[PDB]
Amino acid sequence: VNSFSGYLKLTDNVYIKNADIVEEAKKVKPTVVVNAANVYLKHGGGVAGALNKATNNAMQVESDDYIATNGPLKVGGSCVLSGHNLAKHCLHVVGPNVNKGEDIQLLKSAYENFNQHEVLLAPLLSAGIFGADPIHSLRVCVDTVRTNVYLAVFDKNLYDKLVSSFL
Numbered sequence: 001v002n003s004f005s006g007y008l009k010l011t012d013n014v015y016i017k018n019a020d021i022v023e024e025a026k027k028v029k030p031t032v033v034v035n036a037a038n039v040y041l042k043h044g045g046g047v048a049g050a051l052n053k054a055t056n057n058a059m060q061v062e063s064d065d066y067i068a069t070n071g072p073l074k075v076g077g078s079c080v081l082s083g084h085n086l087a088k089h090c091l092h093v094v095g096p097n098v099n100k101g102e103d104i105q106l107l108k109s110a111y112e113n114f115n116q117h118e119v120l121l122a123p124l125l126s127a128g129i130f131g132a133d134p135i136h137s138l139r140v141c142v143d144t145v146r147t148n149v150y151l152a153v154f155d156k157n158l159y160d161k162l163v164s165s166f167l
């Protein structure tokens with residue numbers, strides 16, 4: 001039993017809700033919140049910009065030190081950093097950005113990072129400003145993640161389409 005509330009159950013391990021991931025994280029304080037990161041951990045907009053803003057830019061400060069030490073992530077890769085005031089940990093995961101021409105096949109590799117964590121709060125990878133089809137992202141999530149994932153979908157209209165079209 002966990003403290004996630006109001007989710008629709010899609011499969012044995014995947015749950016979905018119309019919610020602002022920032023407000024969800026602040027309420028639940030999960031062990032792991034997933035950020036929709038880029039390889040430079042430049043948290044300018046989308047989920048990343050919103051999460052970073054909620055940390056008063058502490059996420060960005062920590063991320064800049066991470067990059068200065070380690071260099072950029074790989075598309076499809078991840079790193080674990082602090083969750084600041086939002087969660088114990090933040091798993092920064094880089095899904096392919098279609099608006100940069102990146103290979104959508106890397107979306108499965110991106111979701112594989114979730115399997116290293118027993119429970120996660122997460123957005124749909126490569127959705128939103130990353131340009132991928134969210135219905136496809138949900139399908140890859142369900143077919144790749146085996147651990148317990150609670151998906152927050154900001155847009156109510158998109159949430160209803162994801163549920164109604166789910167196979």
Ligand SMILES: OC[C@@H](CC1CCCCC1)Nc1ncnc2[nH]ccc12
Binds near residue numbers: 020126127128158
């Ligand atoms: O998938 C990443 C983005 C994409 C959006 C595209 C337009 C329709 C709504 C989704 N989703 C989010 N999901 C949960 N919380 C969020 N906070 C800020 C952004 C955000």
